[PDB]
Amino acid sequence: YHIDEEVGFALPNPQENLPDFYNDWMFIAKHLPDLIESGQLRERVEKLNMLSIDHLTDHKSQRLARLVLGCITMAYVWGKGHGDVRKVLPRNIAVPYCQLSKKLELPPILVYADCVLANWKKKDPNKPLTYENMDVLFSFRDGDCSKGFFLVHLLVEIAAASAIKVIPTVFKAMQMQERDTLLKALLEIASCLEKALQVFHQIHDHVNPKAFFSVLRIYLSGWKGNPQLSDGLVYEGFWEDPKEFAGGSAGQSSVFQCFDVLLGIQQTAGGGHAAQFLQDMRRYMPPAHRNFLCSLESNPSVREFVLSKGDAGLREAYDACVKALVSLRSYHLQIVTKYILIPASQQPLEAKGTGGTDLMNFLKTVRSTTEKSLLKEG
Ligand code: HEM
Ligand SMILES: N[C@@H](Cc1c[nH]c2ccccc12)C(=O)O
Ligand SMILES: OCCc1c[nH]c2ccccc12
Ligand SMILES: [C-]#N
Numbered sequence: 001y002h003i004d005e006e007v008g009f010a011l012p013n014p015q016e017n018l019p020d021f022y023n024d025w026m027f028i029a030k031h032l033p034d035l036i037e038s039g040q041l042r043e044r045v046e047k048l049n050m051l052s053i054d055h056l057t058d059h060k061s062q063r064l065a066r067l068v069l070g071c072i073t074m075a076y077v078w079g080k081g082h083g084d085v086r087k088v089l090p091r092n093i094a095v096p097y098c099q100l101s102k103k104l105e106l107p108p109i110l111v112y113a114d115c116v117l118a119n120w121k122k123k124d125p126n127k128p129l130t131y132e133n134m135d136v137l138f139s140f141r142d143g144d145c146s147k148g149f150f151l152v153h154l155l156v157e158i159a160a161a162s163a164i165k166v167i168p169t170v171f172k173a174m175q176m177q178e179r180d181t182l183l184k185a186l187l188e189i190a191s192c193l194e195k196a197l198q199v200f201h202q203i204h205d206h207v208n209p210k211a212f213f214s215v216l217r218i219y220l221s222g223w224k225g226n227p228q229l230s231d232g233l234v235y236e237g238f239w240e241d242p243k244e245f246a247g248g249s250a251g252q253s254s255v256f257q258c259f260d261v262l263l264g265i266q267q268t269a270g271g272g273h274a275a276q277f278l279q280d281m282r283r284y285m286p287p288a289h290r291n292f293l294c295s296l297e298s299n300p301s302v303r304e305f306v307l308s309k310g311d312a313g314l315r316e317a318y319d320a321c322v323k324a325l326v327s328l329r330s331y332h333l334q335i336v337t338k339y340i341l342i343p344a345s346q347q348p349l350e351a352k353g354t355g356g357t358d359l360m361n362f363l364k365t366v367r368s369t370t371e372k373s374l375l376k377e378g
Contacts, residue, residue: 001292007129008161009254009289010117010154015064016137021055022065024048029068032075033142042086045076050092053100062104063118064137069097070110071138074219077233081141081218085228091237098238105287108235109222109245112252113286116153129158131206144216148206152199153250159199160255163192167262167296174305182305183317190320193259197328203335213343220354222247249355251281254289261296263321264303265373267366274365277357307378315375322374329367336363 004012018026028035028044035041056062072093077086094108101108119137127133131151139146166188173182223229224244232242250256257278260267268279282290306318336359344351353359 002288015060048092067114088234094235140219145207159196163189186317193324220248247354
């Protein structure tokens with residue numbers, strides 16, 4: 001399902017530079033801070049050629065092109081970020097992006113898989129994976145803190161993906177009726193999620209609230225139920241009409257949905273607005289990751305197994321994992337308070353996320369549903 005023991009769902013060292021045929025593309029993406037502040041970005045994209053996508057070799061190259069075309073499309077649509085919006089996207093950039101998006105089974109807009117999972121490099125390949133030894137490929141503006149913002153996600157993915165290699169043990173242990181193995185395995189998955197919470201903490205160090213809310217957040221925004229492009233973005237040449245597509249969010253990460261599926265926390269059940277979002281966001285993941293969540297869903301329920309056995313140590317191990325998810329979501333709400341709610345209040349009905357959710361009801365519903373799945377002695 002394209003999963004690595006070392007790095008998780010991220011590409012193990014993604015493609016940094018394209019074939020030379022797409023040098024028009026790579027120049028605009030690499031120098032986005034300057035071109036946007038100059039006010040000359042839109043002319044530079046409007047004055048382009050319609051480059052055909054046939055000469056992109058493999059998956060790693062196509063995933064860099066997604067990121068290049070995606071970043072460019074955001075810089076073009078939003079502009080300097082003040083209100084001057086572009087409701088129509090040029091035929092020269094839009095058609096190859098739509099064609100590349102249809103080939104990779106993704107929507108034509110920047111997603112988590114682009115701007116986090118394909119948007120990094122190792123400085124000194126020998127040394128271990130960390131904030132000092134890592135750097136993003138692309139930023140949007142100067143002082144947008146995109147290095148810290150994107151890489152904190154990637155490091156939390158990596159921390160959480162230590163658990164993903166334990167999953168086959170869990171289902172093998174249930175199938176073979178091996179209780180002690182299943183107990184050990186669940187505690188290891190809990191241990192990984194606790195360590196993922198510690199990796200989360202550094203967002204305060206590497207990301208400034210005002211920088212995030214006012215500068216960066218507008219470039220991660222999309223155009224599905226967005227007042228600025230209410231009908232949607234027009235992909236000229238490729239599509240007849242405007243088309244709505246949700247903006248980027250960590251809700252588009254597979255790691256952060258898979259533990260709910262693993263543990264039998266039914267976030268996607270019920271038909272309410274939150275479940276609908278979390279399901280819909282699986283179409284904003286690359287197909288291999290969508291299949292991982294699928295495969296995991298098709299397995300027998302760990303929850304049902306644990307409740308059936310009348311076993312305290314097994315229930316407690318299971319609860320460790322659920323607690324860890326509740327801790328992450330509770331902390332994420334504190335991050336939302338510092339990085340959205342307070343910044344929004346210093347700005348001269350319902351607050352909307354970049355993905356389009358009613359964020360405070362949404363997030364608390366998702367945390368609530370997680371808490372309800374705590375067993376507590378059967
Ligand atoms: C400045 C930092 C952050 C802000 C302001 C923020 C804000 C939000 C918002 C508003 C949503 C609701 C969905 C939407 O409409 O977009 C959301 C969902 C989510 N965020 Fe974040 N977020 C941040 C960082 C993170 C990080 C670092 C992670 C994980 C490593 C994360 C994981 C999630 C997940 C998994 C969801 C989906 C709902 C859930 O399962 O709890 N977020 N976030
Ligand atoms: N949904 C967040 C933005 C966000 C947080 N983490 C992300 C990761 C990728 C893309 C977007 C995001 C907001 O409304 O502010
Ligand atoms: O909202 C908290 C973010 C989150 C949900 N599930 C996860 C699993 C691993 C790491 C972070 C998360
Ligand atoms: C978090 N989006």
